[PDB]
Amino acid sequence: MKSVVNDTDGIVRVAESVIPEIKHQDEVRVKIASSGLCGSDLPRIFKNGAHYYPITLGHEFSGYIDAVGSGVDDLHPGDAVACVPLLPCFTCPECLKGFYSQCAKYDFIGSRRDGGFAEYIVVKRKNVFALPTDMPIEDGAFIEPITVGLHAFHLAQGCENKNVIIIGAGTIGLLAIQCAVALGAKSVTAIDISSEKLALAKSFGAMQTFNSSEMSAPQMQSVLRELRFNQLILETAGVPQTVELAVEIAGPHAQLALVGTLHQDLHLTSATFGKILRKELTVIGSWMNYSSPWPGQEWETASRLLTERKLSLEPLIAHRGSFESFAQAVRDIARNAMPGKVLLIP
Amino acid sequence: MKSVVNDTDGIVRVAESVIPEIKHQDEVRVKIASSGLCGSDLPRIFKNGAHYYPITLGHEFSGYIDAVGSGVDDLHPGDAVACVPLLPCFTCPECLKGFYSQCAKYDFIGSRRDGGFAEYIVVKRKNVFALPTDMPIEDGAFIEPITVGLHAFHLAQGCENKNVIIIGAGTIGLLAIQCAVALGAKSVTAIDISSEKLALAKSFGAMQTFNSSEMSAPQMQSVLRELRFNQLILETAGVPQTVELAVEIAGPHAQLALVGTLHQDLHLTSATFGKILRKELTVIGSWMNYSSPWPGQEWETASRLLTERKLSLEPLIAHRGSFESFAQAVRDIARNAMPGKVLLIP
Ligand SMILES: [Zn+2]
Ligand SMILES: [Zn+2]
Ligand SMILES: [Zn+2]
Ligand SMILES: [Zn+2]
Ligand SMILES: [Zn+2]
């Protein structure tokens, strides 16, 4: 079988290996149908940011059950699933509190173990999430990235009647816009360094967009004056400038959910830091996308919003291809901006 | 009358001026009995931190009503009061929502206007808070700093049954320790560079202390393992190193309340920033100490805790003196650490 394997210093290869076998009663094998590249994968591929090399990435995927372990009674060959890539230990104090993303001993498909850029994969039963039978299987690869935004909304106690601001118009951000609209946000504003996805953002329901390469924070704050209360700002870009921006534009008692992980240091002036206090912001760290009961309401919500046609995935997709096509698309990224969702379609 | 007036390049003078007159029907004049120096005043004096110079500081004070304006019907000459130093406009959208500390046009006694390092001051009726008749007048000068900690607890939805960590053993911090104990915290831990102040913290009920000049963050986090859940951390020191320390030591889903204003920039590593997300911290900016109904439950609680003998003020006090003595004590501090509460007793 084929897979995409990344090695040190940005080399991408398509490799051949044996189909993995089920080794435990609680495992299943998935024949992968659709598998997406995450923004978080770019540092793993090009910036020697993976836990090990060689590695096969991929934690945003769907497919059909090919086989099940003898202890699996609620799934059958042919069933459609999405991958739930985190595997908590389920027995430490954090896990028993439902703090799965704080498990000290968790596995992660496509980061801590090999993942879904492959024709087949073997995972635990608890690492798959059954899809509605009428859901196009390709759509299943988007459930995991949908739940990222949903998890942040959940930590913020919802987005209903809030003035939502999404910073970063990558896939996670664009999905978050769609979810905010569907979940009853009063308004949604989208902010990004480029202007391309911003028209797209408006098509997804953002009522306005700010190009941060063309507007300063005070200019944005001025436009936001009427919408300054009950803000929920999601920082999805994961760069110092956008974390700073979020604090600078925030209205009184805004909630600021941090979704994007930084790869450079954050220097805040005393002035900017002071605004966190003066505005009495609530800054909410968000990590992964799970809650109790496992894998969490985020996953059910994502599935439901999709089935209800409240989300639109097609415009998000920049590339569809099998292994060679996908590998070259990944290579073509180098480390510039992500064009859109690059899908591997085995 | 005398007052303490500080000037550019850190000069502290004792000045003579005319007693202020009541000019409006809703003003009162207070003859000041006890007036404290805040940690926040040191940058105003020795670091070009004030809004203007020359300036008379002082926002932690008590005294007796000397005279009232024709429109004041509920206060009388001889009444004991503490100063409520913030004056919001009460007519902007922030104020109408009870967000007084985000008022777009607020005054502040001892920062934006001259304050209580003086024999007499004229303020609005809304700027005084009546004390119980049996409360020792000097105790009144501590109500405002008590409400600082209480306001942070309030924003965090209380400290009851929580594992409270107070970072900074200055007056604000030590008072917050006492309040946390009185309000039913599960545990209280104090962190500071001073073994002195930390012994005091233990005497106030802190079950353990960490000397940050001797212990590293990992060492502290190791000790905190048993108490890592349901943490509420108050950062009261207002220096970059203690904000960093707070994130580094925090347990899973800890609440971090930021009380201390920075007068230096904050440089967080990408790793430290990452911990905000990975631990799913909630970082709560806390600003001043007010809520609806004006001036807020914080003030009632402060008064009550004092009357109920749940707080201990004497050990907090490092100096009592009239104007020359007080002024020299302030000069002796410079940009060294605060010894404890320095009181002006006119
Ligand atoms: Zn991801
Ligand atoms: Zn665990
Ligand atoms: Zn103060
Ligand atoms: Zn106002
Ligand atoms: Zn720096």
Side-chain angles (χ1 to χ4, degrees):
Chain A
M1 78 162 196
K2 285 183 182 47
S3 60
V4 186
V5 182
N6 307 278
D7 216 294
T8 303
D9 294 316
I11 276 70
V12 172
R13 293 185 291 99
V14 46
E16 181 80 24
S17 66
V18 70
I19 318 282
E21 297 297 330
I22 292 175
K23 285 176 175 180
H24 296 95
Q25 68 177 352
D26 66 340
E27 290 178 336
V28 302
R29 183 163 58 238
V30 182
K31 181 178 162 180
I32 296 175
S34 179
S35 187
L37 182 77
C38 187
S40 62
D41 285 326
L42 271 52
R44 298 184 184 108
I45 301 168
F46 296 96
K47 297 347 255 170
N48 290 334
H51 288 116
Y52 60 91
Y53 298 97
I55 190 172
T56 294
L57 302 174
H59 60 275
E60 302 177 342
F61 63 93
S62 59
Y64 298 94
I65 298 300
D66 178 71
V68 300
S70 53
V72 176
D73 62 8
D74 65 340
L75 283 184
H76 303 82
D79 290 349
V81 294
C83 178
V84 182
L86 171 75
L87 187 67
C89 81
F90 291 116
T91 64
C92 69
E94 280 82 350
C95 281
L96 296 175
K97 281 181 179 285
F99 300 160
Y100 302 114
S101 302
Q102 287 78 47
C103 178
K105 222 206 218 203
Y106 69 73
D107 208 347
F108 195 92
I109 292 157
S111 180
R112 297 185 181 190
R113 58 154 287 181
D114 284 351
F117 295 154
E119 290 183 72
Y120 298 85
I121 191 175
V122 169
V123 303
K124 307 307 180 183
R125 168 62 183 93
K126 284 192 151 53
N127 291 129
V128 295
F129 171 86
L131 311 178
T133 54
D134 71 335
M135 176 177 295
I137 189 62
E138 177 178 295
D139 295 4
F142 283 87
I143 293 192
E144 200 275 353
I146 291 165
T147 64
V148 174
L150 290 184
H151 183 65
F153 294 156
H154 179 206
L155 291 177
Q157 289 72 49
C159 61
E160 177 138 32
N161 302 319
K162 298 184 179 171
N163 290 308
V164 173
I165 304 178
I166 306 302
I167 301 167
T171 303
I172 298 299
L174 292 170
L175 288 165
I177 293 170
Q178 300 183 27
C179 289
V181 174
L183 299 168
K186 174 179 178 71
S187 66
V188 182
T189 292
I191 306 181
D192 198 65
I193 74 164
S194 290
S195 57
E196 261 191 359
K197 302 145 172 188
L198 288 188
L200 202 54
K202 298 160 184 275
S203 82
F204 289 155
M207 44 88 58
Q208 68 191 346
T209 58
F210 307 148
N211 188 317
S212 64
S213 72
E214 295 175 357
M215 307 179 60
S216 65
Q219 289 176 323
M220 299 181 197
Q221 234 189 326
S222 178
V223 174
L224 289 166
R225 284 292 290 176
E226 312 184 350
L227 295 184
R228 71 183 178 279
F229 294 103
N230 301 294
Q231 286 180 351
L232 168 59
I233 308 174
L234 268 64
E235 205 305 295
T236 73
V239 297
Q241 300 91 330
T242 56
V243 179
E244 177 182 46
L245 177 69
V247 172
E248 289 292 334
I249 69 176
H253 293 246
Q255 291 169 300
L256 167 51
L258 301 175
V259 181
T261 167
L262 262 40
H263 296 260
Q264 311 183 325
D265 292 2
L266 178 62
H267 182 116
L268 296 184
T269 65
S270 55
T272 301
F273 174 85
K275 290 186 175 188
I276 299 171
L277 281 72
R278 285 180 160 85
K279 303 177 181 189
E280 288 189 327
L281 305 183
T282 298
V283 179
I284 300 162
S286 189
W287 189 239
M288 296 199 251
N289 35 309
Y290 308 97
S291 59
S292 171
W294 183 260
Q297 74 129 340
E298 294 92 329
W299 290 75
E300 302 194 316
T301 300
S303 184
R304 292 168 177 188
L305 291 175
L306 280 166
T307 64
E308 292 170 12
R309 305 316 197 211
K310 314 280 247 295
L311 304 190
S312 178
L313 311 177
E314 193 57 37
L316 303 175
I317 300 165
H319 187 85
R320 282 186 184 85
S322 197
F323 292 93
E324 304 287 358
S325 177
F326 174 84
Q328 190 57 49
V330 173
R331 284 188 281 256
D332 290 334
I333 302 313
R335 207 167 142 259
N336 306 120
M338 187 89 93
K341 180 59 61 174
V342 177
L343 291 174
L344 171 68
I345 306 302
Chain B
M1 74 164 197
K2 290 174 168 44
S3 61
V4 186
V5 51
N6 59 287
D7 213 344
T8 309
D9 36 335
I11 279 74
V12 179
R13 290 185 186 93
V14 46
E16 181 74 28
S17 69
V18 62
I19 302 178
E21 302 299 328
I22 287 171
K23 279 180 269 271
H24 297 99
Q25 75 179 354
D26 63 344
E27 290 179 325
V28 299
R29 181 161 65 237
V30 179
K31 176 180 176 182
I32 297 169
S34 169
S35 189
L37 183 78
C38 191
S40 70
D41 286 323
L42 291 181
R44 289 182 188 108
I45 300 171
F46 298 105
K47 284 183 44 67
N48 187 235
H51 280 115
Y52 59 90
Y53 301 92
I55 189 172
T56 296
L57 305 172
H59 60 275
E60 303 177 343
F61 65 93
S62 56
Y64 298 93
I65 298 297
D66 178 73
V68 295
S70 63
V72 180
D73 53 23
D74 62 342
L75 282 182
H76 300 102
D79 286 350
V81 296
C83 176
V84 179
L86 173 76
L87 185 71
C89 77
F90 296 113
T91 62
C92 68
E94 282 80 352
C95 278
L96 297 188
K97 286 171 177 277
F99 299 160
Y100 302 116
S101 304
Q102 286 73 44
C103 173
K105 172 178 238 304
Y106 70 74
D107 206 357
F108 196 91
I109 289 158
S111 182
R112 294 187 176 193
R113 54 154 289 182
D114 283 353
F117 295 156
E119 288 184 69
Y120 298 83
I121 187 165
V122 172
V123 299
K124 307 307 186 176
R125 164 67 181 95
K126 295 278 185 59
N127 292 131
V128 293
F129 174 81
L131 308 177
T133 57
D134 55 8
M135 176 177 293
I137 188 63
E138 181 185 281
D139 294 6
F142 285 86
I143 291 192
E144 196 276 349
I146 292 163
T147 66
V148 171
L150 292 183
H151 184 66
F153 292 158
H154 177 207
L155 294 177
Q157 292 65 62
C159 69
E160 187 167 345
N161 305 315
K162 291 185 187 171
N163 292 307
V164 173
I165 304 171
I166 308 301
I167 300 172
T171 297
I172 297 300
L174 292 174
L175 284 173
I177 294 172
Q178 302 182 18
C179 288
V181 171
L183 296 172
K186 182 182 178 86
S187 67
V188 182
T189 296
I191 304 180
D192 198 78
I193 64 180
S194 176
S195 304
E196 262 155 343
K197 298 178 184 182
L198 286 182
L200 226 42
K202 292 159 181 289
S203 74
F204 294 150
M207 44 90 59
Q208 72 200 337
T209 62
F210 305 146
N211 188 312
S212 60
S213 76
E214 302 178 345
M215 294 182 67
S216 72
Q219 290 168 334
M220 304 181 191
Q221 201 177 6
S222 175
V223 175
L224 288 170
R225 282 293 282 177
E226 310 166 289
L227 301 184
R228 68 184 180 277
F229 295 102
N230 299 298
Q231 290 184 348
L232 170 58
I233 307 176
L234 269 63
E235 204 306 292
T236 69
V239 297
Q241 300 86 1
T242 53
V243 180
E244 180 185 281
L245 182 72
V247 168
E248 287 297 327
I249 67 178
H253 291 261
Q255 294 169 296
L256 167 49
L258 301 175
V259 181
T261 83
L262 264 46
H263 296 263
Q264 186 176 2
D265 289 4
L266 175 67
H267 190 114
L268 292 183
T269 62
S270 54
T272 300
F273 177 88
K275 295 190 178 190
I276 302 175
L277 284 68
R278 287 160 133 83
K279 300 178 178 181
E280 292 190 316
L281 303 186
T282 297
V283 180
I284 300 158
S286 184
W287 189 235
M288 295 183 191
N289 39 305
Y290 308 96
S291 55
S292 171
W294 184 257
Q297 252 305 316
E298 291 95 338
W299 292 73
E300 302 300 337
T301 299
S303 184
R304 210 196 87 252
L305 287 179
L306 283 169
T307 65
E308 292 174 5
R309 300 172 246 174
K310 301 291 233 314
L311 304 179
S312 175
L313 304 181
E314 192 61 28
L316 309 179
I317 301 168
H319 188 95
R320 285 178 181 90
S322 191
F323 291 94
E324 301 287 351
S325 173
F326 172 85
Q328 188 56 48
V330 173
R331 285 188 286 260
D332 290 339
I333 296 176
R335 186 43 152 191
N336 297 331
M338 188 91 79
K341 177 60 61 184
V342 178
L343 292 178
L344 168 70
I345 307 292

